[PDB]
Amino acid sequence: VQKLFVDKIREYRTKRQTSGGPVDAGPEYQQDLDRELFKLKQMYGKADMNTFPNFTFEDPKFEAVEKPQS
Amino acid sequence: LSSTPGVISAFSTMMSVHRGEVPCSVTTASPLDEATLTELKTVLKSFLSKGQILKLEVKVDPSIMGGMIVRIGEKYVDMSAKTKIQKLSRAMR
Numbered sequence: 001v002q003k004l005f006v007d008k009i010r011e012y013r014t015k016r017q018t019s020g021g022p023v024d025a026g027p028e029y030q031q032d033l034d035r036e037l038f039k040l041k042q043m044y045g046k047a048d049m050n051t052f053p054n055f056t057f058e059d060p061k062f063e064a065v066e067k068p069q070s
Numbered sequence: 071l072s073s074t075p076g077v078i079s080a081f082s083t084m085m086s087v088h089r090g091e092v093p094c095s096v097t098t099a100s101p102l103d104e105a106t107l108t109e110l111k112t113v114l115k116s117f118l119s120k121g122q123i124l125k126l127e128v129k130v131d132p133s134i135m136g137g138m139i140v141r142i143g144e145k146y147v148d149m150s151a152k153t154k155i156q157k158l159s160r161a162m163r
Binding site for chain 2: 008
């Protein structure tokens with residue numbers, strides 16, 4: 001069964017030799033995972049690839065009142 | 071009286087086992103040369119260990135790719151296309 005085994009190892013290395021990527025997928029796997037990630041990134045969040053976030057916040061204005069005693 | 075072939079055909083196998091061996095089944099391909107047949111008939115004689123001259127049948131089934139399945143009574147070793155179905159370890163891991 002080792003002679004059957006190396007026959008499998010041959011066909012993995014011809015699958016390693018790629019130049020156009022998915023040969024058997026075609027437009028079916030290309031339209032799927034592009035629409036699948038964009039449906040998941042819409043649930044994930046709108047964040048850029050290199051834009052680091054920076055912002056500031058405003059604290060509450062500590063006001064005062066009057067009370068006449070003594 | 072209708073079941074009289076059923077009683078007769080049962081009695082032959084019940085009387086067979088008094089000298090019989092529950093024959094084999096090699097189902098691989100087209101019939102091969104004589105040297106491959108006499109070699110399996112002289113190693114299976116070493117397996118019975120009961121002093122009984124084994125009978126055998128050969129069947130042709132091309133659905134098995136390059137291997138053969140062998141049964142000795144109720145033993146059933148296996149060397150066939152199920153070694154291609156054992157490639158789920160590349161998937162199920």
